[PDB]
Design a protein. Structure first.
Lengths: 338, 57, 280, 223, 235
């Protein structure tokens, strides 16, 4: 009876493939053919943020587009004032092994997590004047690879146990559990309306989840290796995934399959982080080859290179107003670019 | 019969994923192009913003 | 008349091309070493900064020697006494800076192996202090003869190899070189002693390779600087028009400058990481 | 100066944060990082216990004025290639192998072979090219009596030696050491421990001291 | 919660010396700069001294420079003001005020209870509060105006204006910091506005507990100066 279900699943996959092929009449490279190229994009380093002593694994900007938070293996979570390079805060982490960090949209809280399988939320605005560990969320059986704030009380976390979770912070319990991935979930991105979110895993697939229902709406499979990063398009109707096969891929939610592939012959290293510009026309991707490329999202042509780091570019972020792009690498330096 | 349960769950997941309305690639590609074109001016990374108003000069 | 009479009193009043070729090779080699240091990013740490300072000092020693060779001979009578003093003090400063760079490298190595540590880091204070010392002391030592501590009006107490330098000044420079050479030798012997004792203390090589490296460095340096040192001791004890070998001082200087030029060979060949960086 | 009073005070706060970060980094850089690895039931628990006597589990101890950190990844059920680069730069790797596992199977093949496979994966990993392994051959007393009645030929069909502790143990050590492809860059320290010995932390101290000597010689350029 | 206690006040003969101690609890004392602020018996507030976190920078008012010395013991969580050559014009109530400075912080957040000292028998921004007092009725709207000799708007866009309320028999309370931002725990009735040298504080639907003296403060040029104060009384 198991074979009957297996053949039903494979014929349903064939139906999925045929349905996707039916709704593919012209490629993206044909529609974006006569549009003007972006041209060579020269972005120079405006600020360099020093003070981390080990390799940096994550960063997040925040809504004010001025402050930012960075997490490093030295055990410090540093909130920087990017305009003046001042260190607003330096939180000593309980566990030195941190590989994700998020900054709340309100700015009152900051989250971190890593190999300790715990998501720690710290209260930045305390009456005592210090930064206290507001909450410790436990329940994942694998390392926390990403975490994003829905609001001051709800947080979505992805873990290496092939599972995502939605937590109510004040209660500390998992409001919802998202299952279906067969590999470690490496990154997640929240929709602009924060009602859906996409998670990329090590099974070379990306899944779209509904926050309310808790179920997976769509699955996208175009990569040939581990998906390390994911990011929605600004309009929320598409997303981009960077993987270990040295390719990025733009997928569409409404059409349900892949739109564009961003790759180059001389690029053979994986992508650690992807991000979109304010208008979505530029896709910025950090690579293992010490660099960070800037692709034309519509034309797939490479538009620029951000070569300023002496080690792997591990984290990448773009401000909400789009003024600057911050890249944090394994040489313990963040760099602001315009 | 845990394997049967997992296979069945995957089967109804595939049914739920096979009943969505998919628009053509041309329509969504045009939508993405239109979104990029509409917000092109508000993007300071595309056009290097003058030094008088960006904060990092 | 000063150059004429102070050369007449000593008795030297009256092969360079190959020496200049060796010089040019020295500039080429030290430029290669500096470029290798400058390219690789992982080399941007105090040890390789000290090695680069040694390379720069050897570069200046080579250019000073080729300048000397061009300006010596029959065109040393064209120079005014001030230009003579500059000509001789440039070389003095270059060689002093080179040997003080060896001292700085030895001191940094001894401190690194003394404070046992796990991640040495970039101690910019000690680096800058040592670099500034090995340069300032060299400049002052080379500048003493022209300030007024020289042979003019002191003819009967005048050296033979440098007929305008004071014999007491050569004694002072010789004493400084003795102190500096013994400092380097003691530091390297102590480095080997600590490494060997620490290795023997733990039970379950590096000490033999370190002994080979130390022997190579010390033997090359001592062998190259020995003849010039012997001649500098000899000219003080030799009255003018007595010791003939003081005239043929142009070979011991060659030996010293070849030491300056083979220092990069020693400090790159022994370091396997620098060989790997230079091959690519 | 264009700064305001509040801006000056913020810069002063940033400078204090900088000096506290420098002090914390100086304190942490004087501490030895050991990554503890091994198969299930190899004896990592016994090793942690012996060090204590003298997600991720961290063990702190002190010996001869050195502070030692062990990171027992242990119950981290995930792909090692997604988080193993976090431990690049640890002072050493402590690998635990159970000798008694030479004739035990999980699958239907010897546990010693998974030990060899994971040792080969870790030793020859691209991140740990310079990191030195500290191989622990635990359960020597169990092996000494197992070998008397169960030939080593079960795990090694090509072993032609006798069923004696010394020869078989040396052969197993050689088999594990042969998996080292980075002979020139890294070196492997092998110690034959048990559950009832007290010289393990001393051996870890000596191996770490040797690693520190070699690292200092590299820093000086003498190596 | 956070609380500061002032001690060491009393009757002192002229020319004498005294030691005021502010003991802090409930907050990270080491991370906060500390101000000593004076209030004469029948007059308004006046800034006296300041010591930063880590004692890096220390400032005094030109009135008390040389005679007064401010210090802090972080492990003891205490703040000292040593006063020498006491003049008859130094008789007043002294407050220790905590103040933390980073991006988006609220300086002068908490004030101490105050200790009473009774001495027995240009180039500074002049903040002007023209109106000494106004009559008010509960449920109405009142506006308190302020003026500055020099513009308080900096090149970084921050307008360094602070508003305080001192209810009768109580220490001053921070309402508005940097001319716009509401302090934590302050009702949204209070709103700060203005630009450059002219400033105003607006209260909408004032309640019975809004009765007191409202002070105007600048934080741009460091010789900190307060306004004369604008008393509010009911009818
Ligand atoms: C601590 C360390 C730095 C001590 C030290 C001591 C000595 C020297 C040094 N320079 C020199 C020299 C000697 C003869 C000559 C000979 N010329 C040929 C003659 C001519 O035709 O006019 C002149 C020369 F051109 C240079 N001799 O010693 C450097 C460093």
């Amino acid at each position: 009876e198991l074979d009957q279900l297996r053949q039903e699943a494979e014929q349903l996959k064939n139906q999925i493939r045929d349905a996707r092929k039916a709704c593919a009449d012209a490629t993206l490279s044909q529609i974006t053919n006569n549009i003007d190229p972006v041209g060579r994009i020269q972005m120079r380093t405006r600020r360099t943020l020093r003070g981390h002593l080990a390799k940096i694994y994550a960063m997040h900007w925040g809504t004010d587009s001025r402050l930012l938070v960075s997490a490093s293996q030295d055990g410090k979570l540093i909130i920087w004032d990017s305009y003046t390079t001042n260190k607003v805060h330096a939180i000593p982490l309980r566990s030195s092994w941190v590989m994700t960090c998020a900054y709340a949209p309100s700015g009152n809280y900051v989250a971190c997590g890593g190999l300790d399988n715990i998501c720690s939320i710290y209260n930045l605005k305390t009456r005592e004047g210090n930064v206290r560990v507001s909450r410790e969320l436990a329940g994942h059986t694998g390392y926390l690879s990403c975490c994003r704030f829905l609001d001051d009380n709800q947080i979505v976390t992805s873990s290496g146990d092939t599972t995502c979770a939605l937590w109510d912070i004040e209660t500390g319990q998992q409001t919802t559990t998202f299952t279906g991935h067969t590999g470690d979930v490496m990154s997640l991105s929240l929709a602009p309306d924060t009602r859906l979110f996409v998670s990329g895993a090590c099974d070379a697939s990306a899944k779209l989840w509904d926050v309310r229902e808790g179920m997976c709406r769509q699955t996208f499979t175009g990569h040939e290796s581990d998906i390390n990063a994911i990011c929605f398009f600004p309009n929320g109707n598409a997303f981009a995934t960077g993987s270990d096969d040295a390719t990025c891929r733009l997928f569409d939610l409404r059409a349900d399959q892949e739109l564009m592939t961003y790759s180059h012959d001389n690029i053979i290293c994986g992508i650690t982080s992807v991000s979109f510009s304010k208008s979505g026309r530029l896709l910025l991707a950090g690579y293992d080859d010490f660099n960070c490329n800037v692709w034309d999202a519509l034309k797939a042509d490479r538009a620029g290179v951000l070569a300023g780091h002496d080690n792997r570019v591990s984290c990448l972020g773009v401000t909400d107003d789009g003024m600057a792009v911050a890249t944090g690498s394994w040489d313990s330096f963040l760099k602001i670019w315009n | 019969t845990a394997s049967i349960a997992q296979a069945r769950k995957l089967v109804e997941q595939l049914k739920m994923e096979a009943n969505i309305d998919r628009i053509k690639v041309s329509k969504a590609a045009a939508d993405l192009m239109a979104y990029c074109e509409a917000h092109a001016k508000e993007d300071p990374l595309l056009t290097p913003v003058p030094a008088s108003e960006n904060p990092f000069r | 008349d000063i150059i004429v009479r102070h050369y007449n009193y000593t008795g030297k009043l009256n092969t360079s091309v190959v020496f200049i070729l060796i010089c040019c090779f020295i500039i080429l080699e030290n430029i290669f070493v500096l470029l290798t240091i400058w390219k690789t990013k992982k080399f941007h740490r105090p040890m390789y900064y000290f090695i680069g300072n040694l390379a720069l000092s050897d570069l200046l020693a080579g250019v000073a020697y080729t300048a000397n060779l061009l300006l010596s001979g029959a065109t040393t009578y064209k120079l005014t006494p001030a230009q003579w003093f500059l000509r001789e003090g440039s070389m003095f400063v270059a060689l002093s800076a080179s040997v003080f760079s060896l001292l700085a490298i030895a001191i940094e190595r001894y401190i690194t192996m003394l404070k046992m540590k796990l991640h040495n880091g970039s101690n910019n204070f000690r680096l800058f202090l040592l670099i500034s010392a090995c340069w300032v002391i060299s400049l002052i030592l080379g500048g003493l003869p022209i300030m007024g501590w020289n042979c003019i009006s002191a003819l009967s107490s005048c050296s033979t190899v440098l007929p305008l330098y004071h014999k007491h000044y050569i004694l002072f420079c010789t004493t400084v070189f003795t102190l500096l050479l013994l400092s380097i030798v003691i530091l390297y012997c102590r480095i080997y002693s600590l490494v060997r004792t620490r290795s023997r203390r733990l039970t379950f090589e590096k000490s033999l390779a370190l002994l080979k490296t130390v022997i190579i460095v010390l033997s090359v340096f001592i062998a190259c600087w020995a003849p010039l040192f012997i001649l500098l001791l000899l000219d003080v004890g030799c009255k003018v028009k007595t010791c003939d070998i003081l005239f043929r001082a142009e070979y011991f200087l060659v030996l010293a400058v070849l030491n300056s030029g083979t220092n990069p060979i020693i400090y790159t060949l022994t370091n396997k990481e620098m060989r790997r960086a230079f091959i690519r | 100066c264009t700064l305001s009073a509040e801006d000056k005070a913020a810069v002063e706060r940033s400078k204090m944060i900088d000096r506290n970060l420098r002090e914390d980094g100086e304190k942490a850089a004087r501490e030895v990082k050991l990554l503890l690895l091994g198969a299930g039931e190899s004896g990592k628990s016994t090793i942690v216990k012996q060090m204590k006597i003298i997600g991720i589990v961290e063990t702190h101890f002190t010996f001869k004025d050195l502070h030692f950190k062990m990171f027992d990844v242990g119950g981290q059920r995930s792909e090692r290639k997604k988080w193993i680069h976090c431990f690049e730069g640890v002072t050493a790797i402590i690998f635990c192998v159970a000798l008694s596992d030479y004739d035990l199977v999980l699958e239907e093949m010897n546990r010693m072979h998974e030990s060899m496979k994971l040792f080969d994966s870790i030793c020859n990993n691209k991140w740990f090219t310079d990191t030195s392994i500290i191989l622990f051959l635990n359960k020597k007393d169990l092996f000494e009596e197992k070998i008397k009645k169960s030939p080593l030929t079960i795990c090694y069909p090509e072993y032609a030696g006798s069923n004696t502790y010394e020869e078989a143990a040396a052969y197993i050590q050689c088999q594990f050491e042969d998996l080292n492809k980075r002979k020139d860059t890294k070196e492997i320290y092998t110690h034959f421990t048990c559950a009832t010995d007290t010289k393990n932390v001393q051996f870890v101290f000596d191996a770490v001291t040797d690693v520190i000597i070699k690292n200092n010689l590299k820093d000086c350029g003498l190596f | 919660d956070v609380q500061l206690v002032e001690s060491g006040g009393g009757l002192v003969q002229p020319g004498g010396s005294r030691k005021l101690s502010c003991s802090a609890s409930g907050f990270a004392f080491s991370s906060f700069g500390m101000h000593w602020v004076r209030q004469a018996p029948e007059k308004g507030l006046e800034w006296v001294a300041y010591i930063s976190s880590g004692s890096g920078t220390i400032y005094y008012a030109d009135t008390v420079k040389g005679r007064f010395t401010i210090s802090r013991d972080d492990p003891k969580n205490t703040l000292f003001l040593q006063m020498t050559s006491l003049r008859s014009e130094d008789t007043a109530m002294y407050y220790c005020v905590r103040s933390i400075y980073y991006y988006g912080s609220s300086p002068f957040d908490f004030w101490g209870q105050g200790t009473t000292l009774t001495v027995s028998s240009g180039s500074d921004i002049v903040m002007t509060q023209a109106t000494s007092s106004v009559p008010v009725t509960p449920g109405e709207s009142v506006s308190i105006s302020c003026r500055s000799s020099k513009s308080l708007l900096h090149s970084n866009g921050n307008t360094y204006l602070y508003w305080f309320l001192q209810r009768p028999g109580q220490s001053p309370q921070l309402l508005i910091y940097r001319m716009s931002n509401l302090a934590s725990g302050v009702p949204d009735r209070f709103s700060g506005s203005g630009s450059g040298t002219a400033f105003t504080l607006t209260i909408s639907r004032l309640e019975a507990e809004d009765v007191g003296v409202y002070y105007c403060m600048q934080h741009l040029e460091y010789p900190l100066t307060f306004g004369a104060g604008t008393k509010l009384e009911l009818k």
